[PDB]
Amino acid sequence: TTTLAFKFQHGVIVAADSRATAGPYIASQTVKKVIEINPYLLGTMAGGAADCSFWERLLARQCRIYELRNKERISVAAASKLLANMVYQYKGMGLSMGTMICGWDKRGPGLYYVDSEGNRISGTAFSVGSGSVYAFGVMDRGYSYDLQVEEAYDLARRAIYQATYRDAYSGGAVNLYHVREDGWIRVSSDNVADLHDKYTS
Amino acid sequence: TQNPMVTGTSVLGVKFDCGVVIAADMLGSYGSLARFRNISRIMRVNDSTMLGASGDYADFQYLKQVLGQMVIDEELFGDGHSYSPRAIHSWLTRAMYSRRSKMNPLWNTKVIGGYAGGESFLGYVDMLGVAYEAPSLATGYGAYLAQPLLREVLEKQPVLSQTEARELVERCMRVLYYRDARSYNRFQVATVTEKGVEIEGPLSAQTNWDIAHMIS
């Protein structure tokens, strides 16, 4: 429903799509940066906006879940990452807010996708996004998106979406960091520039 | 920048340091809004035997810092086994009290000029009422930073390490000028000198008002 960390579900994977951006949307403070951070190999997330705030809540989420997963020898789910983030952030509220992370893992009841925002919204949908400009994007994408898309098939879907998105979008100094998450692993498909993909596609 | 509303204000205090001494003129007179409650007030404090400090801005606020500095010094001197008040110690400590209050949305405003002589170094330092420390060449305080300081800086630019005497004429000159440009001034002003003897600040001495000029 908004950008900055966004995910949509498939059976085979989830798509992880994110921006590299510095500051507010009015200027960058750097050009080289990747804001993409790997908190656990369960999935990737990274935002922007109120910078301290996103990093703080995810770092708590990362601490709790990772200790529990690693020691217990029981894999934590989509539901668990989401519950930790939710419980923490409402408490901390009044100390700036703007967390926009997308939680993925495969569970006993099948693949589960929950969208975590800083209001305290916790949502499953066709595609969800939290941050800013993807709000427009969910409209075109839904049409070109099946319930279950293959990984390869999904990579081609991202390339077209983006290539039109750069033409519409007027935010510069970004990269589209593309990751497919095959469950409790995370691999990086490509980290292609938004300026490159308009020519290709 | 913000500053609290000031009632009793200390304003224009110059300080320029010469070898193993500093000369200062600070007003001895603190107006409270309008009425000059104390024409006899002392903005000069004794941290220890070879330190002095002189402060401007809200006079009230200056007294809060004096006590904290005072209680810390009282415990630390007298024993002098290796611990006592030292030139670096007074500057930083006083800066932190000011920082502590900077964290709150109301800060206690005084802008201070430390001249000290510690364990081996003669120091002339500037402390702010929100914090910050540095060694300084010449600094003004309160109203002196906006109004006279640049003409004082200009005299200093050929010779930055001149004598007490040359400083003494400038400072004596500066009160006739104080009256002319700013209002909440008196011409009974205090001459403070920090030396190796101690911190001396005799009573208010005066010279001409000189606002009787009209020649164009």
Binding site: - | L76, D79, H81, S82, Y83, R86, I88, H89, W91, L92, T93, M96, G118, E119, S120, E133
Partner: protein
């Protein structure tokens, strides 16, 4: 006896044996020597370990950018006290921003150590500390007891069989004062070796040095530059 059931138990003489008995614990610890000149404060220490097939973990601890300590006694307790001192030294650096006085820091340890010795149903801390610190009044090397009293020495040795080492300290007492950094460390090694038997002469591996002074901040040499001080051998001077 029953002059040492708790650290509140007085003897008719008017002495708590547990605080005294806590000093006997310092003798179980490893030999450390503290020496000062007029520009450096030097700490010479014995490191021991259970694996000598592995590098020996330092017995010199970090307190400030010009303060280092050498412990003799209880290892956990010395580290335990160290943290109170470390917190204060680093805090002193924020607030006061002088290079903190050895005499000032040491008295604050005296207030905390007094707490359990004053308190019933507790043990004193049986660790003796030699602190090297350099402030702007020059070096000081101070000894702090298992009690709470301090000595400002020019040279001190507390630890195992420390008497043997003092015989050296008594003999070159005049010399310490004039020295530069190099000279302080060679004397402390010659002292250090004496504690131990006649036929054991130190290696660099089990020697850690914490050097403090006017020309330097805080550097710990574990074998780094230990080899030249050790050179010029002298073996157990009686």
């Amino acid at each position: 006896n029953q002059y040492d059931n708790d650290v509140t138990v007085w003897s008719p003489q008017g002495r708590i044996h547990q605080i005294e008995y806590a000093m006997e614990a310092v003798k179980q610890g490893s030999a450390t020597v503290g020496l000062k000149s007029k520009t450096h404060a030097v700490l010479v220490a014995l490191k021991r370990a259970q694996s000598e097939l592995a590098a020996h973990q330092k017995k010199i601890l970090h307190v400030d950018n010009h303060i280092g300590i050498s412990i003799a006694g209880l290892t956990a307790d010395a580290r335990l006290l160290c943290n109170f001192m470390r917190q204060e030294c680093l805090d002193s650096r924020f607030v006061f921003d002088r290079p903190l006085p050895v005499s000032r820091l040491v008295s604050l340890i005296g207030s905390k150590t007094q707490i359990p010795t004053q308190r019933y149903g507790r043990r004193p801390y049986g660790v003796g500390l030699l602190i090297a610190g350099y402030d702007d009044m020059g070096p000081h090397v101070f000894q702090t007891c298992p009690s709470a009293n301090y000595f400002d020495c020019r040279a001190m040795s507390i630890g195992a069989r420390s008497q043997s080492a003092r015989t050296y300290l008594e003999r070159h007492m005049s010399e310490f004062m004039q020295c530069n950094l190099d000279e302080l460390v060679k004397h402390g090694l010659r002292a250090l070796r004496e504690t131990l038997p006649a036929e054991q002469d130190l290696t660099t591996k089990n020697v850690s040095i914490g050097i403090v002074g006017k020309d330097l901040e805080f550097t710990i040499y574990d074998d780094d530059d230990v080899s030249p001080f050790l050179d010029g051998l002298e073996e157990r001077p009686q």
